[PDB]
Symmetry: D3
Subunit: 152 residues, 6 copies
Amino acid sequence: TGAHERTFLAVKPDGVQRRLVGEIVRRFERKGFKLVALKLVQASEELLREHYAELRERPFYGRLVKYMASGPVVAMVWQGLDVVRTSRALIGATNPADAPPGTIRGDFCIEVGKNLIHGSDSVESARREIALWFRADELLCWEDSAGHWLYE
Amino acid sequence: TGAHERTFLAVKPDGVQRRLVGEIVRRFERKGFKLVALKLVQASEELLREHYAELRERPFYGRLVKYMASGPVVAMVWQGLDVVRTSRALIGATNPADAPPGTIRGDFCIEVGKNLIHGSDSVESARREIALWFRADELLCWEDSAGHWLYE
Amino acid sequence: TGAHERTFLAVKPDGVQRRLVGEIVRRFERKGFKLVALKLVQASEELLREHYAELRERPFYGRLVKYMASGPVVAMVWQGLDVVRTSRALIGATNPADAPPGTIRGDFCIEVGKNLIHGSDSVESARREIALWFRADELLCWEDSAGHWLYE
Amino acid sequence: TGAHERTFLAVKPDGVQRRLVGEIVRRFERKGFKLVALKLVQASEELLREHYAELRERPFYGRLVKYMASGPVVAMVWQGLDVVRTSRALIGATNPADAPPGTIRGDFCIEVGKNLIHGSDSVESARREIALWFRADELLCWEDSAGHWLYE
Amino acid sequence: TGAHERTFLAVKPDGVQRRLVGEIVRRFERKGFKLVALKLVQASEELLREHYAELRERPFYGRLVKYMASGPVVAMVWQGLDVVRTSRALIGATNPADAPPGTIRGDFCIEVGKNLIHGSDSVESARREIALWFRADELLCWEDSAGHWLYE
Amino acid sequence: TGAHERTFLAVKPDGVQRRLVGEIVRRFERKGFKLVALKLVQASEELLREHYAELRERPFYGRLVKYMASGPVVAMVWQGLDVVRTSRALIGATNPADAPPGTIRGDFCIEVGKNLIHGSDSVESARREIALWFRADELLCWEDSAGHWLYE
Ligand SMILES: O=c1ccn([C@@H]2O[C@H](COP(=O)(O)OP(=O)(O)O)[C@@H](O)[C@H]2O)c(=O)[nH]1
Ligand SMILES: O=c1ccn([C@@H]2O[C@H](COP(=O)(O)OP(=O)(O)O)[C@@H](O)[C@H]2O)c(=O)[nH]1
Ligand SMILES: O=c1ccn([C@@H]2O[C@H](COP(=O)(O)OP(=O)(O)O)[C@@H](O)[C@H]2O)c(=O)[nH]1
Ligand SMILES: O=c1ccn([C@@H]2O[C@H](COP(=O)(O)OP(=O)(O)O)[C@@H](O)[C@H]2O)c(=O)[nH]1
Ligand SMILES: O=c1ccn([C@@H]2O[C@H](COP(=O)(O)OP(=O)(O)O)[C@@H](O)[C@H]2O)c(=O)[nH]1
Ligand SMILES: O=c1ccn([C@@H]2O[C@H](COP(=O)(O)OP(=O)(O)O)[C@@H](O)[C@H]2O)c(=O)[nH]1
Ligand SMILES: [Mg+2]
Ligand SMILES: [Mg+2]
Ligand SMILES: [Mg+2]
Ligand SMILES: [Mg+2]
Ligand SMILES: [Mg+2]
Ligand SMILES: [Mg+2]
């Protein structure tokens, strides 16, 4: 939806425990994206198994699901032009060893299993993840007065 | 409840619009308090009238309610020793003119009607506000690994 | 003039040399004040003797004038409600030893003669200083889209 | 010129409105470059048409000129070794979508038309732009005590 | 000794564990004080009992000694005008509940037993503590190029 | 040694003089590495000639040795997975002109001779440099409570 494109991000348990929620949110805010949903939740294994359905055959799947269910996550939806692709760039490579300094994982993480945050990998993935984690009435439309200074 | 004391905070519409959500959360995180609930909501006038019931006879009540209903707020609950009183200190005086530099309002605001954030003014106020804004199942218990370094 | 009140600030040579110009500007920006004039200048002794006319009988006058003429300063005008008094609070006490942490001098300076910045001490002082340092056509009126979130 | 190389930078209207002037200045300061001119101006369309003469055949030229004339810009000259090329690197690609995190545009912008800042693209361009925007007597020589720690 | 006054600071185990060493050092650096000694050590109970000799009859003494011996501390000596008194101001009140925002303890701590840092409380205390924790040959004299911009 | 890998880092004299010690330490802290040794020292030419033995035939060797002996350095050892390689990435290319923004040299330096920091270039180099700069009893083992959130 051009500037109405949306992505799903989640601060993983390690991000909450290391007190980096503010830091992470601040990076998306300063970039210009619009926060349209946010909540702290404890996700069920049932929800996480669907979230990570595509990874079901992978050897880390079981531990990934257990870990993501082990503590609070901060679920979020962000809106803006190219937000899915750009979010992934801000976050950095899956494996923090390949994420350059300046990215979230490049600055804050070491190991792939403790890489702070999840972000949708495509517009289609984001659509699915947003619907899985949030009801329609948790996604807010608000008139963004900053928008005039971010978009032509 | 000692170290289990809780307070309710809300980033007002001006805080969201000015992109200070991360900045505000980061201040409470770095202080050591535990985030136990968080959501972006559009509060109803009905909720706000009860939230501000003690101010009903004051002439700014109506415009305060309308303003707080005018756009998204970020509702939060924070836990720790003396969190209500300490939160109020971090926020600063109601009127930003009286809030010293180092406080949120001292650093970021000018006028009383645009003062970025609400915080409970007492343990009793927090009890009521927490119940009004959040269900029990939105308040998360998590084992805080930082706690050993914040509390004796 | 209410929200149209203006003050004159100058980053002294120590602030330029220590690379704190950005830092200082950012504190006024984040507070919500409107930047209406800015320039890097080398002030003449003639200008400075009049700028500090009220200090002419004081023993530090001569050295203060010579110092402020010794290198570039960053001259500025900021606009907003109570900007003169609030600016002075953000800056902190004249003698940095009495300036609490959170203030510019509290955070960044040690000695009274190297205290980073000048700010007008009154609306009348600001009127004079603005006229003395800037032409009317250097003071810019611009429509401040942040103003809606700083003022009722 | 070596370490005396100079570039012209301007914070565009979006940078002023979003309160990123100090943030931008601070990045050049912390890098070690020397600020040799600075002013807040409202540029005429006449000046801007000459500034962007090489872009006259491009479809965005008209809107670019109108936009840059629409509000204050912060004009600047910075001095140091390789300052033109290095400035461009710190700013990031023209299109923020191609600018990595860590760059100004990578961190703060989304769209090409709202990309915060202009920087000269060559030593020759900088010479022209500096002369177009500043008089000789606005470019200051000062003894930079940090220079001993930036240059061998 | 005027500008040659020195104080002893130590980042307590909680400060190391919470990753606030750099943050703390940066505050003294940005203030203008001169770092003249620094090391990561594990203090013995024997050293700490003498360090806190004046507190020997107090009920928290035993736990304070055990805690400070429980993990690494970062020992430091800082030099500058009024450094003992000013350090204490930057650190904030012993009990973080009384330490305003802007101070280290005001911003980063909650409880008196986990208050991040020790600073000498007097010139006499600093003399003793410096001698107890560091040899003369660990205290470095260096020519401080920033000094001209901090001191008249 | 996996997560027990260690590297040697030193803040060069320019890093101390420009007050970037805290800033540099903070970057390694926030990345998740464990600080296992730290001291401010004045290195002898004899030690530095061995430190840089591999560069003995290079034309900058003499000046490099003299410079590194000219003022205090902050010697450090950091521990964690892939710490040698990752440290080098965080620091950035030898020549700051090739170091992107987000890296220490990319953000803070201009010239190769004033590039703020040394980091070992291999596990073998780190082992040698650690032995050359530190005694065994200066390298501290401590139980890292953050480790659970950085490593699986
Ligand atoms: O060897 C691996 C690869 C991936 N993951 C985790 O699986 C998550 C989702 O995997 P995916 O390949 O989808 O990466 P993403 O798209 O989240 O970067 C990652 O973010 C990692 O935390 C893991 O634990 N081990
Ligand atoms: O004259 C006033 C007093 C208060 N308020 C607003 O009303 C809120 C609640 O007022 P209260 O007296 O409860 O102060 P608080 O508890 O928020 O410090 C404040 O935070 C202000 O935004 C206002 O607009 N005008
Ligand atoms: O004993 C003194 C008092 C003042 N000043 C300097 O002179 C400036 C102007 O003095 P004034 O009394 O106007 O203080 P201000 O209004 O700047 O706080 C101060 O900012 C200091 O930099 C000084 O060097 N010594
Ligand atoms: O397709 C385009 C290309 C450029 N620009 C704007 O035009 C400015 C100047 O264009 P130029 O190609 O000179 O880029 P720059 O030198 O600023 O990177 C850019 O910075 C953009 O703001 C635009 O709006 N659309
Ligand atoms: O009731 C108390 C008082 C003090 N302390 C600890 O003991 C240290 C030293 O106490 P002192 O009175 O010397 O305070 P300081 O000089 O550190 O402010 C403090 O910093 C606290 O960490 C404590 O645990 N409980
Ligand atoms: O042409 C050169 C190359 C290197 N160096 C300095 O010598 C140090 C060691 O050089 P080396 O190639 O070992 O680089 P490093 O491993 O430190 O990146 C560098 O960090 C520079 O400070 C220099 O002055 N000139
Ligand atoms: Mg994935
Ligand atoms: Mg209230
Ligand atoms: Mg005055
Ligand atoms: Mg161009
Ligand atoms: Mg004491
Ligand atoms: Mg090398």
